[PDB]
């Protein structure tokens, strides 16, 4: 009985890590941050509505300049948006209309777009030739791609639907590091400001810490009861929040590897498709399937306000890198920007 | 505003015009979600490296058809099947020469019960409450020489019927068309075809014609 013995000792050391997480805690975040001043009503009206899509939008991403945002949809068009003046900077056609991820490079020279075709396409934006053309056809994933965040101008981290994350290159097109350890399809990804660790979200309610340089998990997060659909990373670098499909958002710890706080209400039932922070870290934007978003007081677990105004379900939202505004994409072919 | 901003918004207006004129093409494109069991006969209806969605296109009687096969995708179905709100109709290809052999690779269930589970999963979705089905029950030519040697009751202990073509075919129609929880919104269009038969593209055209008629009654406030 080798398999039974190894399984039972693996379960014993799983109870060991669970008891370590329990005994390391002393107090919850409620009874030490309930004595501070609450955040008032965050009444943020929409300012720019980036109309022009003719299909449902699954992905948007801001830039380091906090002015240009790109958006991917099932119209076959990847559109870069001048958010200040409501202007279409570019309209990148796609060889596959089935895309659910997009990312704008920190250098601003590249944009990613992938999806159900299981191929990551990276487009070179600022070229001497005046057009946008694809640079590399990143292939090797056996599942559907879900997130394609740019590590830098030369490395991209792509999470696919075959329980694997990967780190790619540009000059070669091969997989430098393959991440294994999930049992469900990965649906979210979020990098770090120091760019050394990234968290993932799979279909088995498991969130890991895949380091970049050597490429293995650091700790496992299993607190949700449904699949984790969206993930986002705290600006300090010691926390991250997950948005699952059971009307719960929850923070974690990069170093204490324990549950901090849950963000749920009796009214909200549907799941979360998009979650993001503010650059101060107190507001937690979260997009639901009730055709609206919400701002969450991360230190109080209190709904600080609603962001209603979208006709269809919001699937993607991100804030600017200077914390100026939040742009909430949705399935109504609209891009509302709130401030 | 500046002259550079004027040229920028002129470029944006040109991009909007291009988006309008190539989204105008999306009306004539009739999208079909072709899916089914592995080696269930879905290959023989499209005869007449991506490792993702197989993309094919054909036209007939001034109507553009795109068949969106997801047979090469082995991920969890429920987290990407919500992308197909705007599909015109669903192509469900299951064979009839599959009742006797159970899986031919593993031993858990039969092909017919797998088709039942797939059709039950695709019929009760929140995303597919109104999409019509052009369900194809193919490989009926090889079904009759396989129904004489082995009866249909070896997999169905509730049949108790005559072992022939018409009775087994009618029981197949009844057992595929009863899984719809709302027959007042979606009528399954069962059809028979073979490898060397006439064109079923006429039946496909009639079905998508009915779906387009339903959409035309929908958007004019008369449905």
């Amino acid at each position, epitope marked *: 009985s080798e398999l039974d013995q190894l399984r039972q000792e693996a379960e014993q050391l799983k109870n060991q890590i669970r008891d370590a997480r329990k005994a390391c805690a002393d107090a919850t975040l409620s009874q030490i941050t309930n004595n501070i001043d609450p955040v008032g009503r965050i009444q943020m009206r929409t300012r720019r509505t980036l109309r022009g899509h003719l299909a449902k939008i699954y992905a948007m991403h801001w830039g380091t300049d906090s002015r240009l945002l790109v958006s991917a949809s099932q119209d076959g068009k990847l559109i870069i948006w001048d958010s200040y003046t409501t202007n279409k*900077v*570019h309209a990148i056609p796609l060889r596959s209309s089935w895309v659910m991820t997009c990312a704008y490079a920190p250098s601003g020279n590249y944009v990613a777009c992938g999806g159900l075709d299981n191929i990551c396409s990276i487009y070179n934006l600022k070229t001497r030739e005046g057009n946008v053309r694809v640079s590399r056809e990143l292939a090797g994933h056996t599942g559907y791609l879900s997130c394609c965040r740019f590590l830098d101008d030369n490395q991209i981290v792509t999470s696919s639907g075959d329980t694997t994350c990967a780190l790619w290159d540009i000059e070669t097109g091969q997989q430098t590091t393959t991440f294994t350890g999930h049992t469900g399809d990965v649906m979210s990804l979020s990098l770090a400001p120091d760019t050394r660790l990234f968290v993932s979200g799979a279909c088995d309610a498991s969130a890991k810490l895949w380091d970049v340089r050597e490429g293995m998990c650091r700790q496992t997060f299993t607190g949700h009861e449904s699949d984790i659909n969206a993930i986002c990373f705290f600006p300090n670098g010691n926390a991250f929040a997950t948005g699952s499909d059971d009307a719960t958002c929850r923070l974690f710890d990069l170093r204490a590897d324990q549950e901090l706080m849950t963000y749920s209400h009796d009214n909200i039932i549907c799941g979360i498709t998009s979650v993001s922070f503010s650059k101060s870290g107190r507001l937690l934007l979260a997009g639901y399937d009730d055709f609206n978003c919400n701002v969450w007081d991360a230190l109080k677990a209190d709904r600080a306000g609603v962001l209603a105004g979208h006709d269809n379900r919001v699937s993607c939202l991100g804030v600017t890198d200077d914390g100026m505004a939040v742009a909430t994409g949705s399935w109504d072919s609209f891009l509302k920007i709130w401030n | 505003l500046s002259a550079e*901003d004027k040229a*920028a918004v*002129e470029r944006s207006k040109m991009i909007d015009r291009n988006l309008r004129e190539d989204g105008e093409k999306a009306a004539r494109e009739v999208k079909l979600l072709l899916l089914g069991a592995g080696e269930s006969g879905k290959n023989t209806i499209v005869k007449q490296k991506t490792t993702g969605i197989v993309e094919t296109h054909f036209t007939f009687k001034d109507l553009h058809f795109k068949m969106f096969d997801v047979g090469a995708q082995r991920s969890e179905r429920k987290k990407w099947i919500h992308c197909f709100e705007g599909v015109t109709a669903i192509i469900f290809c299951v064979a009839l020469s599959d009742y006797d052999l159970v899986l031919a690779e593993d031993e858990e269930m039969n092909r017919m019960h797998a088709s039942m589970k797939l059709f039950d999963s695709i019929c009760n979705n929140k995303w597919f409450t109104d999409t019509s089905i052009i369900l194809f029950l193919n490989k009926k030519d090889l079904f009759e020489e396989k129904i004489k040697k082995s009866p249909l009751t070896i997999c169905y202990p509730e049949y108790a019927g005559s072992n022939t073509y018409e009775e087994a075919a009618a029981y197949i129609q009844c057992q595929f068309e009863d899984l719809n929880k709302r027959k007042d919104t979606k009528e399954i269009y069962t059809h028979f075809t073979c490898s060397t038969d006439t064109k079923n593209v006429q039946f496909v055209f009639d079905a998508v014609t009915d779906v387009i008629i339903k959409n035309n009654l929908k958007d004019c406030g008369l449905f």
Partner: single-chain antibody
Amino acid sequence: VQLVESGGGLVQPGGSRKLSCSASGFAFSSFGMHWVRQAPEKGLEWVAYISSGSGTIYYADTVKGRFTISRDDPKNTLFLQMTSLRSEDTAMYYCVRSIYYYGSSPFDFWGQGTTLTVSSSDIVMTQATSSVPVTPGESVSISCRSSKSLLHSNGNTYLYWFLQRPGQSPQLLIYRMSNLASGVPDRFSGSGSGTAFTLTISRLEAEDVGVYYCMQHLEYPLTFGAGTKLEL
């Protein structure tokens, strides 16, 4: 990227010609073309402008109603038709690409140029200095002056810097306040605020000599600066 001019030559006074540019090797349909001429005894002057897809047309005041500009996107050609041209139009004409969006670099590429010889409230830029004696490896800082302010409401200065090498086409050098074009080494620095404008070069090389020019892109027409040639 190629902008090869064609046609032209010696013409009788009061006649007509057709300046055609085979603008091939690049996406011609996404670039707003221009037309800049240069008198043999004077500097550069812009004469015409066509936007992408013939959306917007602008002309110089000297050639308005006398010059015809036209383009055809499938054939990748930019035309320039002049009728009853005067001896004041005796110059060599350059075709210029210009794309316009956020962060774009207008006036990026120029043509070789074909000579045209005739037989027998505008924001202007002034550069009084010319034929500046410089030494290689040293630092020089030329200056440029504008008639009015160039800081628009959207917080940027629309000033363009160029470099015309001897026997060569002008090249884009600095295309706003304090930013660098593509292919220019990280040596040419731009600065200045309001109407006082300047350039900055760290260590001059052998190919850095030539005549430098200014340009505003705030209102039309698009008149240049003066000669700012450098000498060894």
